[PDB]
């Protein structure tokens, strides 16, 4: 039992960490070109999605 | 150019030229070293690897004295510390042999004292030298333009 | 004044002045920053918080060439880096408009080259501006004279 | 001399001199202080304590232009910062009152712009002052010469 519970805990932890890293990298990729340029007329869908 | 383009010092040599535009400092990632200015040494550099750059916010005092961005780039001659650069067919080129290592980060200047591109490297194609640079776009996109065979200075 | 008065750095900006008199260096407490002189950075400062000041013993090589002190204060005009200051009714005043933030710690000099008071702040009455400063007495008592509504510079 | 001789600074005071000869930087043990140059600060100094010296390999970028040395020592006058040292009877002398603390490590130059010896100190014998230095020899040897009652500058 303890083995399966710790395995499930590790699975959810690595899943959450991977999702967080992926959304952060997507934010980097889709934001850094606009942060280096003036007047970032950004459709706010990406930011509103990935700020939280 | 001379007033507001700070080289990057390291081991007694200048390795690049960090530039402040639009109230933000940029410094190419491929080059390593320390900035001469004491103000710029205290800024947090957020790194963009895909464009080979890192950028940070300039302090309150130095925001007003910065070079101006641009979007419109008609083909022709453009200013540069080493002379003039030809822009044609969506490509930057210079006479063969001009420039070299340690000149990375040097901004290309417009007639009205406005920055058009930042020098990252140069590829020698025999007759001229094609400049691997980063340019702006009409929709505010920093396109990293690199001709084949580009080598980072 | 210019030779002996040192600017203070706050993120690369002038925000006050540290004054040396009689072999002791004084600096207003409310002004935060680093002394430009490398040597004075190593001088330990002991603080009079109620007087809004810190004073410290200065080194051996520069105590002699110091702003000589005095205590006699007849009413009239007295020297100042920005011009002349009027001492009347036991109050130091200036024309309304001159002076402001960053001028704290500015010494007020005499015609013979001696110091009469050190500026800490000012309050605008509309007609003139009364300076909240520290003024000495015949019995060797330093009274921090602050007119009502004083705001430190 | 002026171009390629770097003072040694400690606590804002110049206390010594380090010299580059033959592509190597020598500094004297008795004096303590930093070197303002980044590269010379980054050089690993190998210390001969009995010789009262530390020598380190000069970087590549300035090894090409370095002071040349010599071993032939005809007696007579040899130029240096504050005049000419007289060499006679296997000894260096300088008129009374010239030199003092802080001049250690100052090279002695030849008429052809070549270093012959490095000064470590002096000793007062009344009529003149005899220099305790590090002379060289034709057989690939370095000999420190000191008089009676030496005091290292």
Swiss-Prot record, chain A:
Protein name per Swiss-Prot or TrEMBL: Spike glycoprotein E2
Membrane-traversing stretches: 3-23
PTM text: Palmitoylated via thioester bonds. These palmitoylations may induce disruption of the C-terminus transmembrane. This would result in the reorientation of E2 C-terminus from lumenal to cytoplasmic side.
Membrane topology qualifier: Single-pass type I membrane protein
Stretches in topological domain Cytoplasmic: 24-52
Disulfide bonds: 30-51
Region (Interaction with the capsid protein): 25-29
Annotated localization: Virion membrane; Host cell membrane
Protein purpose: Plays an essential role in viral attachment to target host cell, by binding to the cell receptor PCDH10. Some specific strains may also bind host receptors VLDLR and LRP8/APOER2. Synthesized as a pE2 precursor which is processed by furin at the cell membrane just before virion budding, giving rise to E2-E1 heterodimer. The pE2-E1 heterodimer is stable, whereas E2-E1 is unstable and dissociate at low pH. pE2 is processed at the last step, presumably to avoid E1 fusion activation before its final export to cell surface.
Subunit structure: Interacts with spike glycoprotein E1. Processing of the precursor of protein E3/E2 into E2 and E3 results in a heterodimer of the spike glycoproteins E2 and E1. Spike at virion surface are constituted of a trimer of E2-E1 heterodimers. Interacts with 6K protein. The E2-E1 heterodimer interacts with host PCDH10 (via domain Cadherin 1); this interaction mediates viral entry to the host cell.
Residues carrying lipid (S-palmitoyl cysteine): 30, 50-51
Annotated stretches, region: Transient transmembrane before p62-6K protein processing: 32-52
Full-length numbering of the shown residues: 686 to 737 of 1236
